Amino acid sequence: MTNTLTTDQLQELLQIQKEFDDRIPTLNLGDSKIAYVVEFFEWFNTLETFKNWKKKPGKPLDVQLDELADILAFGLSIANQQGFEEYDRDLFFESFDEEYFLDFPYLRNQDMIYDMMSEFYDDDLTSIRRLVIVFKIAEQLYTIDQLIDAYKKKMKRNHE
Amino acid sequence: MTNTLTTDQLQELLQIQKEFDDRIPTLNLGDSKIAYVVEFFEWFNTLETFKNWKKKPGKPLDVQLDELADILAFGLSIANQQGFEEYDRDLFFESFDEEYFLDFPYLRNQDMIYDMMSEFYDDDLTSIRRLVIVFKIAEQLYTIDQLIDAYKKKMKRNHERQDG
Ligand SMILES: O=c1ccn([C@H]2C[C@H](O)[C@@H](COP(=O)(O)NP(=O)(O)OP(=O)(O)O)O2)c(=O)[nH]1
Ligand SMILES: O=c1ccn([C@H]2C[C@H](O)[C@@H](COP(=O)(O)NP(=O)(O)OP(=O)(O)O)O2)c(=O)[nH]1
Ligand SMILES: [Mg+2]
Ligand SMILES: [Mg+2]
Ligand SMILES: [Mg+2]
Ligand SMILES: [Mg+2]
């Protein structure tokens, strides 16, 4: 069952993020939104689907998951900063369950980056959507469990 | 060594890039365009204008210039792959000379990244424009000379990659 997300897991992740962000008095929503986008590209660079010049493209899994965990962190951070109640959690699991286009072949296509950019400059981009994106990448390319594991490791390192 | 770019310097850069890209039989325009965008973000990440949580934000200058050089390389690559004649060179220097918005305060504002993204998703984005962007960053935040220096170093290293 290593590739499903429960409401308890999501709430624990939000709490872990909140306790870290509590240490950062400059915490700023505009910056965290920019940070999400930059981390997304850092992650996309580890995937290397556009790097036709590599003999063996793709950085190591742990490196890919570490970068994916940085996206989650800002996604969780934006969620907490905006306020993320039960109704928001409900809508997240409904959006996740109803997402049919963010699958493996789509996410492996280097051109997906343009679609993502379009969503990233849209000022209506929601905190729910940002989380759906990162969790669907985890579900389809990795597992949710591996993302959560990598996130917990990274957050411990971030605390030091 | 003047923070200016001449037509001879630009033509040398294009020739350096062509000779490297000649070694890459999978050379692909869509991939190079994607690569330009990715390297732009790798470079923006070294600037750290959005990273309010850092005691001392901004990676070292050599790191920042190295990443800036990777953008130049794909910009030069896209130029050569599309064809870059005299008329293209003429129009580049006119665009560069006529660019008044891409200055230091604008480029230091984290929010510029959204403007850049909009330009990057536009399929009408030109090879000239991509070069204007990277050379204005060099001019305003660094010097053109430092970019060229960093690009030449990086291309030597890149030749050694394909060597082994
Ligand atoms: O407000 C914040 C800021 C940072 N962080 C954490 C999340 C993420 O794991 C990490 C990202 O911070 P940096 O971008 O500064 N370090 P990174 O490991 O990404 O290296 P680089 O900056 O070289 O890409 O810090 C937060 O959780 N909240
Ligand atoms: O067609 C090409 C391919 C690569 N290059 C050069 C430009 C740039 O300096 C470098 C980019 O390739 P990589 O992304 O593999 N090197 P980097 O260490 O920057 O990548 P990463 O940080 O993702 O490991 O190789 C070209 O000039 N033309
Ligand atoms: Mg980072
Ligand atoms: Mg990162
Ligand atoms: Mg790179
Ligand atoms: Mg690079």
Author numbering:
A (entry chain A): 1 to 160
B (entry chain C): 1 to 164
From the paper:
SaPIs are clinically relevant pathogenicity islands, residing passively in the host chromosome under control of the SaPI master repressor, Stl. Some Staphylococcus aureus phages encode dimeric instead of trimeric Duts, which are completely unrelated at both sequence and structural levels. The crystal structure of the ϕDI Dut described here represents the first structural characterization of this group of dimeric Duts, revealing particular features. Remarkably for unrelated proteins, our results indicate the de-repression mechanism used by dimeric and trimeric Duts is conceptually identical, involving dUTP as a second messenger turning off Stl-Dut interaction.
